[PDB]
Amino acid sequence: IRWELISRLCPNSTGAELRSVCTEAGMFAIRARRKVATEKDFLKAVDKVISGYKKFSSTSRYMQYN
Amino acid sequence: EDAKLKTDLELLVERLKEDDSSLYEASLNALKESIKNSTSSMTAVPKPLKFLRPTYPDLCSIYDKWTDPNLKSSLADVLSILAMTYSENGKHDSLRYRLLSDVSDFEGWGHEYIRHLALEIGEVYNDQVEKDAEEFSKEDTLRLCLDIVPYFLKHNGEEDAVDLLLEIESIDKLPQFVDENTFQRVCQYMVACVPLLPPPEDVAFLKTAYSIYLSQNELTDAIALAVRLGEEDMIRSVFDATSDPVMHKQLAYILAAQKTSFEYEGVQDIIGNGKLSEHFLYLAKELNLTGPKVPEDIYKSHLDNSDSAQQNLASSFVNGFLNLGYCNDKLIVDNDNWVYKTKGDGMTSAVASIGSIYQWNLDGLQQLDKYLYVDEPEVKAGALLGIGISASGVHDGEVEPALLLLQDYVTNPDTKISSAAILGLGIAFAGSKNDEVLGLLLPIAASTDLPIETAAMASLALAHVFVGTCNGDITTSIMDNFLERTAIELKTDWVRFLALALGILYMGQGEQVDDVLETISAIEHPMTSAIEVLVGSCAYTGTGDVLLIQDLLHRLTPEAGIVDELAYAVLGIALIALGEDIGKEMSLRHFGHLMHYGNEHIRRMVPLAMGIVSVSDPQMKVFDTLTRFSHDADLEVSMNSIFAMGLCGAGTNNARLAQLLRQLASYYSREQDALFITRLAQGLLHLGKGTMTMDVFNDAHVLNKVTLASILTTAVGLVSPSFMLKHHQLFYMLNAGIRPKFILALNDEGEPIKVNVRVGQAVETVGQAGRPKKITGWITQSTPVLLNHGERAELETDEYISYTSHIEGVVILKKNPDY
Amino acid sequence: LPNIYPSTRCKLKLLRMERIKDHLLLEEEFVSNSEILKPFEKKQEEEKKQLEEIRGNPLSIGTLEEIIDDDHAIVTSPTMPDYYVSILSFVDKELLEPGCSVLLHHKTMSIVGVLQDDADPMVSVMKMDKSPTESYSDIGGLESQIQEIKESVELPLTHPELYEEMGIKPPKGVILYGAPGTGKTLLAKAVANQTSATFLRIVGSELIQKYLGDGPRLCRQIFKVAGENAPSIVFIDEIDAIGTKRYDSNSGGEREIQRTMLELLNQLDGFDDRGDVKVIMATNKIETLDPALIRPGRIDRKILFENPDLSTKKKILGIHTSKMNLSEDVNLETLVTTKDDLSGADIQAMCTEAGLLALRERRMQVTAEDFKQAKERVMKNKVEENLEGLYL
Numbered sequence A: 001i002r003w004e005l006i007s008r009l010c011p012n013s014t015g016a017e018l019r020s021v022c023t024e025a026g027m028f029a030i031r032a033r034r035k036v037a038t039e040k041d042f043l044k045a046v047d048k049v050i051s052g053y054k055k056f057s058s059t060s061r062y063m064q065y066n
Numbered sequence B: 001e002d003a004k005l006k007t008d009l010e011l012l013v014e015r016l017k018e019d020d021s022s023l024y025e026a027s028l029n030a031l032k033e034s035i036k037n038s039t040s041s042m043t044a045v046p047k048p049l050k051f052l053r054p055t056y057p058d059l060c061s062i063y064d065k066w067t068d069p070n071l072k073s074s075l076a077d078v079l080s081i082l083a084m085t086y087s088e089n090g091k092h093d094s095l096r097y098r099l100l101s102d103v104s105d106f107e108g109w110g111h112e113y114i115r116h117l118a119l120e121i122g123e124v125y126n127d128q129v130e131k132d133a134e135e136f137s138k139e140d141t142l143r144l145c146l147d148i149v150p151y152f153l154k155h156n157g158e159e160d161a162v163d164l165l166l167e168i169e170s171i172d173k174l175p176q177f178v179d180e181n182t183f184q185r186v187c188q189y190m191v192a193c194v195p196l197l198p199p200p201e202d203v204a205f206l207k208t209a210y211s212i213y214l215s216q217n218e219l220t221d222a223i224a225l226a227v228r229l230g231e232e233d234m235i236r237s238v239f240d241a242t243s244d245p246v247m248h249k250q251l252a253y254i255l256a257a258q259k260t261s262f263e264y265e266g267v268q269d270i271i272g273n274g275k276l277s278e279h280f281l282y283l284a285k286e287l288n289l290t291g292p293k294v295p296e297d298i299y300k301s302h303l304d305n306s307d308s309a310q311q312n313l314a315s316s317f318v319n320g321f322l323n324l325g326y327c328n329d330k331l332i333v334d335n336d337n338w339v340y341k342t343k344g345d346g347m348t349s350a351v352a353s354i355g356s357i358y359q360w361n362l363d364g365l366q367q368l369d370k371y372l373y374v375d376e377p378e379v380k381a382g383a384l385l386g387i388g389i390s391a392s393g394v395h396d397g398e399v400e401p402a403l404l405l406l407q408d409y410v411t412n413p414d415t416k417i418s419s420a421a422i423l424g425l426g427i428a429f430a431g432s433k434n435d436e437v438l439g440l441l442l443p444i445a446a447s448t449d450l451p452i453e454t455a456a457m458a459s460l461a462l463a464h465v466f467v468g469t470c471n472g473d474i475t476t477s478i479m480d481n482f483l484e485r486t487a488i489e490l491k492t493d494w495v496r497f498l499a500l501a502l503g504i505l506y507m508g509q510g511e512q513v514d515d516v517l518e519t520i521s522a523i524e525h526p527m528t529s530a531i532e533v534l535v536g537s538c539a540y541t542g543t544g545d546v547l548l549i550q551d552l553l554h555r556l557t558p559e560a561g562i563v564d565e566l567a568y569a570v571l572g573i574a575l576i577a578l579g580e581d582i583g584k585e586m587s588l589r590h591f592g593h594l595m596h597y598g599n600e601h602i603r604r605m606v607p608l609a610m611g612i613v614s615v616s617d618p619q620m621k622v623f624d625t626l627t628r629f630s631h632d633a634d635l636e637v638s639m640n641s642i643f644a645m646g647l648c649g650a651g652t653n654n655a656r657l658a659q660l661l662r663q664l665a666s667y668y669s670r671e672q673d674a675l676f677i678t679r680l681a682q683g684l685l686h687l688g689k690g691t692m693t694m695d696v697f698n699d700a701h702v703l704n705k706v707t708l709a710s711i712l713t714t715a716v717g718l719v720s721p722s723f724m725l726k727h728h729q730l731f732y733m734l735n736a737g738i739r740p741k742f743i744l745a746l747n748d749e750g751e752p753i754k755v756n757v758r759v760g761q762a763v764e765t766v767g768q769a770g771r772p773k774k775i776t777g778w779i780t781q782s783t784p785v786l787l788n789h790g791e792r793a794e795l796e797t798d799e800y801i802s803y804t805s806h807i808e809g810v811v812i813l814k815k816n817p818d819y
Numbered sequence C: 001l002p003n004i005y006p007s008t009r010c011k012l013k014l015l016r017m018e019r020i021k022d023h024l025l026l027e028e029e030f031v032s033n034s035e036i037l038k039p040f041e042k043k044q045e046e047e048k049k050q051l052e053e054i055r056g057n058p059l060s061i062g063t064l065e066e067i068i069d070d071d072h073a074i075v076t077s078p079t080m081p082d083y084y085v086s087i088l089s090f091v092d093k094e095l096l097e098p099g100c101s102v103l104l105h106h107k108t109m110s111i112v113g114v115l116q117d118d119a120d121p122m123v124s125v126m127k128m129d130k131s132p133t134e135s136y137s138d139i140g141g142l143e144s145q146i147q148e149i150k151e152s153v154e155l156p157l158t159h160p161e162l163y164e165e166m167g168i169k170p171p172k173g174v175i176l177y178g179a180p181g182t183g184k185t186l187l188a189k190a191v192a193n194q195t196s197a198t199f200l201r202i203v204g205s206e207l208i209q210k211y212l213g214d215g216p217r218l219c220r221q222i223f224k225v226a227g228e229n230a231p232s233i234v235f236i237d238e239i240d241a242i243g244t245k246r247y248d249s250n251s252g253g254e255r256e257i258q259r260t261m262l263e264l265l266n267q268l269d270g271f272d273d274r275g276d277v278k279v280i281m282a283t284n285k286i287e288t289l290d291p292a293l294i295r296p297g298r299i300d301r302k303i304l305f306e307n308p309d310l311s312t313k314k315k316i317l318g319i320h321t322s323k324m325n326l327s328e329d330v331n332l333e334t335l336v337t338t339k340d341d342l343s344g345a346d347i348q349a350m351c352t353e354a355g356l357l358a359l360r361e362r363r364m365q366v367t368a369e370d371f372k373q374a375k376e377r378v379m380k381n382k383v384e385e386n387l388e389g390l391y392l
């Protein structure tokens, strides 16, 4: 797996979002019954989490307060 | 009208007592059809049936003066029908009413009356059984059983038919009626009869079910019942009933999982377990478990933190348990100075861990070879012992390298080296009953003029090699070692292992020895009683007889021999109760009550009693009481509790019990012995990264005699755990009864193929009708999975027909053209 | 006692309870023999007599405050002057949690037992004690949302093997945001139907209390109760209520609501490291929610609910009209399956209205005219929409 590519395709996301990306990548393999999650699974998971769940993001408002 | 029906009853009775033959026949037939119509609604005690009660004495009196065989024959049937409400149990009315007349084809009557007559048949058959101690003949009952059985078989009364044939004790007539659609449910309801039904009818049930299966070409269960029976010629007959080679390979896989040495040409590789190593490395590749786990990774001491030799020994044991069968590790393989960190006996287990890691793989012999050249006797003994484990449970057809390399070092004058040699011989050939091993060990073993430790370990090796079916020569040799030795040596802890070795020989059969018990009873040494009860209860293992449990408890109710007999008592009750899970659950409360009122010697086994009974299935209600007794006093009790956790959590990777074990590691850290046994329990908890277990009994309730033998070997002398703390080399005995726990959809050519496998909690098919599912809470899981203790498997896909019905272990598939 | 197989009559069943009685009598015999062997003068049931006479009567009730120098404690009864009560051996020194209800002796006032609360004066309402009704069959369509909720909340509890083997901690929380009246509450009822865990429902309004102090107090109590009765499926509903409304009964105003929300956002994640407490919130207005709550790591899988489509509408019609005393004149195909906009709530509302109207006429069967009248009745009683005019 290419961890550098996965990290690059996830700009300005707090570590909790990376943990959620890992969890969803693990989940997507389970739904397809595969016992090993591959890069194609991680890409789908990171797209879904970072892009799909972007309107419900916290790191863009609270940054102004800091 | 109902009043008109009462008038019909009265007038028909009057015409029956009217002597006219035409009136005789008319009233007889009219009452026959009326009581047939009285059964229009066979419920709520029909009102015509209620009103027939005062009539029954009138029909009886009329029948007494009747002399019409062409008409009284049907009146006998009528009296049989009316005897239902005429309960008066013990009078056996309807049964003798069904006699005399040749109209006993009662199929025209309702299910209620037929059930009632079957119950009366059972009652009067019990009355005949008592009548044949301290009227209808035994052959007389067959006259109606041979009609009732087809009636039940036709009208889905398979359970009722089996019940009736059991109460009549004539189950040998069952196969004459079995249909191609009826056999499966009859057997499924019938294979469960063996554990609970009182002997010796259990063997009769097994043989009858085997006969049913053979005639239906369903050898998948038949091989299992043959293994239960243990008759080798019966397994041979199963083999001769098959012409397709694929079924031969699959039966070979089943009996290799059972570790039973049945010799067959062209198949010997599969039965010899030679393909297990490749299957396991394929499993490791598929589950991505190839990456070895450090014992520190198991400890996780870095997260919980603010003698080096013993901790190194514990780490070596953990590493050996972790990477077992994966043939790769980073702690010991690449670090030769690692062995030197352990001192004394620790060096032996250090090298033995390499053989443990290379188990089932002949590759490991090369790595173990280098440590054989080291002049240190402990290193030589450790490597030599690991040689057997590296090929444990593996038997090529012609020349076992382990036997060739092992036989030279048995006669070594060193006690340690010879002990390791005999231990490795027992490990490698466990459950094989090898004839060359027989002829080597039998003169080498016994030897009442040899060190008692060596003799005891050789006896343990003998017991592991020959499990079940008994053996006269081994028994005579063991009793020769029982001669007197010397009075002090009989008090040593080694004689306990000799007693266990004697006991293991008969564990399979039960109720079959019945003679050595007298021979043991003819000796009046103080230890003899303990050996007697231990062997007697060990033979009965897998049955659940309660009278033996009463005897064992009477022994329990209230000096070294006394300690040993009280020790064997709880192990015996645990083994006997280790049959049906109902006996399991009752034995839990038994051990609880005994722990309530028990002396201090018996205190430090109740944990082990829970552990052996509940091995590889970490049920919730088992380990909480174990945790309660872990913080209790009598440090040996705590050690036993944590080892019972380890056995209970064997291979399940239970994170909850792992957290409990880590907490106990934090607590019992001052006492280094407790820390060492805690780390051993940690290593056993995550054995083989979760792909292997200590399960005593598999699906279809076969008995893995090797696994039980290993568990008893490790639990027999641990009432004094300091002994195995000194001699820890016996802790590798678990590697003899260890087995993988997985599914593998082998193709016809012999390669794994992906397929959907339905996995869920097991449910029995006993009282359910039709075709109910055997799985609750299904998971649509793919090719090889890890079904825990309590789950079966079944093919979701319509295609890929499995030859074996029981989907466990290696499974072969064929492409059904449908869909 | 264990369970009994099989259900019907069978000789093996009789053998099973024969083993039951055999083992039970054997335990009874062992206990009898053990007792008889014991020195009754300090054994058997004389221990009960000694415990009763040492305990004294009546046992008063107080509150524990400390465990200093075990075998000593400072109780605080509501009226007594807070004695320096000593702790006796009979009591279990593991349940003496500071703040429990101990049993003081009457005269000497030494603790002779801990009275467990076992009251739950408010939690009993919260604690789901009987499964509501609907199973997952009653939900028409929504297959993806059901799959997601299952693999998030059910599979971790019933079937942890997949997750532990895969090596991922299960997704912590799920928020069901969507349009009003679209099954966001039904799916919670379904997951409450098949459950092996306690289901403590709470609605966001009840967290807007009146006093300043009891804003975080309620949330702390709810999550503590969820923790002790592990696992828990706490179902905070109408979570947007804290933001909007601005109730007059609330003394603090906005600030107290902010403190309550801060306590909620802590208790969900916490420094305390709570165990198996799954959280399922559902709201109509996901917009007016402070993004601290909906941040990943607190509630991971944010399931979206959408108004049903035509096929989903017909499936909902079929499932809801399954238990109908329907005359054949009614045609389900053109009944409400018209493509002129509906919702998951309208389909059931019109069925209820038509059933009521049929009851009014005492007609046991349902007429197509009544169904049409209820259809138009539901149509008029409908705030249509506002944003469609932008795209109209």
Ligand SMILES: Nc1ncnc2c1ncn2[C@@H]1O[C@H](COP(=O)(O)OP(=O)(O)OP(=O)(O)O)[C@@H](O)[C@H]1O
Pocket: C138, C139, C140, C141, C142, C179, C180, C181, C182, C183, C184, C185, C186, C187, C284, C316, C319, C343, C344, C345, C348
């Ligand atoms: N797909 C569906 N299948 C079956 N019933 C449905 C479906 N969608 C909605 N319903 C019905 O709609 C009714 C009302 O909707 P419901 O209360 O579930 O909506 P909600 O959006 O969760 O509620 P609220 O907006 O009031 O918080 C429910 O009683 C349910 O029976």
Ligand SMILES: [Mg+2]
Pocket: C181, C184, C185, C186
């Ligand atoms: Mg709702």
